Amino acid sequence: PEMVRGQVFDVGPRYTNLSYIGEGAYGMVCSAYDNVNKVRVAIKKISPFEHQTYCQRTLREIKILLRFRHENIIGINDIIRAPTIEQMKDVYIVQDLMETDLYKLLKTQHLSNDHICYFLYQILRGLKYIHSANVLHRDLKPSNLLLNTTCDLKICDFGLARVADPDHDHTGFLTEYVATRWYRAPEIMLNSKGYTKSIDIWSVGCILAEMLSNRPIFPGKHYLDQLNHILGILGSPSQEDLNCIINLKARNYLLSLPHKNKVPWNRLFPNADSKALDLLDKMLTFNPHKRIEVEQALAHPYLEQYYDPSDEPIAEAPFLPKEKLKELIFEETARFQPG
Ligand SMILES: Nc1n[nH]c2cccc(Cl)c12
Ligand SMILES: Nc1n[nH]c2cccc(Cl)c12
């Protein structure tokens, strides 16, 4: 077995000459030379089987990424695992190798307005397809946007995804932890389980803001702080927007706050394209019902050089204990075995 940092990284003989890239959600990530297709590839080792939540996430991701086929969504090229359920301790997911990701780029590179436009276009193009399949990504953030040397962008990590369920979205105050904090819509903290498409649009808005300045727009220091940062920029919600929050704990919290004025986007982002700030405003709407949808966002003037709905495809086919989830992961990966 190939070894990387004294841990088994067992993918051979098809995949050789491994280099450590980083660590994924729970497991190691390497590049490797693919001896069939004669390209270097990315391979992430997942060791999920003792923890039901890693089993769940592994199976979601496998099921979704095997059904999806889109230029702006990472595929699965191959899956490696032992030939029997008994011997299977690890699963390796083989994907296109991408040079970098938007997290790494934003830490080091100023983006021209043309780069911001093209990246945002690709994000929304991929999102159109995901949403058209009635799926919510639910963890969109720069580190889940992979980029290659010619700035092609692919959305990755579908472990936290769900099927949309707008009729069952309502919940109480300060209960929910959907998404990564900086990219979490205000309603998550107030009255939303994150089961509507508007959750992803908020995250995209946050990413666009971050492309504009190389800094997260809402850098909450901890879970409770995240609302402070959102309201600090958007200002106090309107009466109409408060009237949409029927839950009393959530409503009365908001009513308890001193008035806060909106910070104008052109003061926060003085170098930004005015069309980009108009779209940003629309994606970072407090009220999720008023928030722009993915197809509207694509049709926005900022994206006019790229927009072409005939070239923005949709999905053809819209969408348990750990021992049964191992069996389902075994069944789902069977197509990649010699046979
Ligand atoms: N923790 C995880 N986040 N995203 C994943 C995708 C596949 C498998 C796992 Cl365990 C995860
Ligand atoms: N560099 C990468 N190319 N492709 C990937 C898929 C998942 C995780 C990573 Cl880090 C990569």
Swiss-Prot record:
Changing residue 164 to V: In NS13; results in increased MAPK signaling; increased translocation to the nucleus; reduced interaction with DUSP6; no effect on interaction with MAP2K1. ATP binds at residues 21-29, 44. CDD domains: STKc_ERK1_2_like. The modification Phosphothreonine is found at residues 175, 180. Its cofactor is Mg(2+). PROSITE patterns: MAPK, PROTEIN_KINASE_ATP, PROTEIN_KINASE_DOM, PROTEIN_KINASE_ST. Its EC number is 2.7.11.24. A motif (Cytoplasmic retention motif) lies at residues 308-312. Changing residue 313 to R: In NS13; results in increased MAPK signaling; increased translocation to the nucleus; reduced interaction with DUSP6; no effect on interaction with MAP2K1. Phosphorylated upon KIT and FLT3 signaling. Dually phosphorylated on Thr-175 and Tyr-177, which activates the enzyme. Undergoes regulatory phosphorylation on additional residues such as Ser-236 and Ser-238 in the kinase insert domain (KID) These phosphorylations, which are probably mediated by more than one kinase, are important for binding of MAPK1/ERK2 to importin-7 (IPO7) and its nuclear translocation. In addition, autophosphorylation of Thr-180 was shown to affect the subcellular localization of MAPK1/ERK2 as well. Ligand-activated ALK induces tyrosine phosphorylation. ISGylated. Keywords: Acetylation, Apoptosis, ATP-binding, Cell cycle, Cell junction, Cytoplasm, Cytoskeleton, Disease variant, DNA-binding, Host-virus interaction, Kinase, Membrane, Nucleotide-binding, Nucleus, Phosphoprotein, Repressor, Serine/threonine-protein kinase, Transcription, Transcription regulation, Transferase, Ubl conjugation. Phosphorylated by MAP2K1/MEK1 and MAP2K2/MEK2 on Thr-175 and Tyr-177 in response to external stimuli like insulin or NGF. Both phosphorylations are required for activity. This phosphorylation causes dramatic conformational changes, which enable full activation and interaction of MAPK1/ERK2 with its substrates. Phosphorylation on Ser-19 by SGK1 results in its activation by enhancing its interaction with MAP2K1/MEK1 and MAP2K2/MEK2. Dephosphorylated and inactivated by DUSP1, DUSP3, DUSP6 and DUSP9. Inactivated by pyrimidylpyrrole inhibitors. SMART domains: S_TKc. It catalyses: L-seryl-[protein] + ATP = O-phospho-L-seryl-[protein] + ADP + H(+); L-threonyl-[protein] + ATP = O-phospho-L-threonyl-[protein] + ADP + H(+). It is an enzyme of class 2 (transferase). A motif (TXY) lies at residues 175-177. InterPro entries: Kinase-like_dom_sf, MAP_kinase, MAP_kinase_CS, MAPK_ERK1/2, Prot_kinase_dom, Protein_kinase_ATP_BS, Ser/Thr_kinase_AS. The modification Phosphoserine is found at residues 19, 236, 238, 274. Binds both upstream activators and downstream substrates in multimolecular complexes. This interaction inhibits its tyrosine-kinase activity. Interacts with ADAM15, ARHGEF2, ARRB2, DAPK1 (via death domain), HSF4, IER3, IPO7, NISCH, SGK1, and isoform 1 of NEK2. Interacts (via phosphorylated form) with TPR (via C-terminal region and phosphorylated form); the interaction requires dimerization of MAPK1/ERK2 and increases following EGF stimulation. Interacts with MAP2K1. Interacts with DUSP6. It is linked to Noonan syndrome 13: A form of Noonan syndrome, a disease characterized by short stature, facial dysmorphic features such as hypertelorism, a downward eyeslant and low-set posteriorly rotated ears, and a high incidence of congenital heart defects and hypertrophic cardiomyopathy. Other features can include a short neck with webbing or redundancy of skin, deafness, motor delay, variable intellectual deficits, multiple skeletal defects, cryptorchidism, and bleeding diathesis. Serine/threonine kinase which acts as an essential component of the MAP kinase signal transduction pathway. MAPK1/ERK2 and MAPK3/ERK1 are the 2 MAPKs which play an important role in the MAPK/ERK cascade. They participate also in a signaling cascade initiated by activated KIT and KITLG/SCF. Depending on the cellular context, the MAPK/ERK cascade mediates diverse biological functions such as cell growth, adhesion, survival and differentiation through the regulation of transcription, translation, cytoskeletal rearrangements. The TXY motif contains the threonine and tyrosine residues whose phosphorylation activates the MAP kinases. This is Mitogen-activated protein kinase 1. It comes from Homo sapiens (Human). The gene is MAPK1.
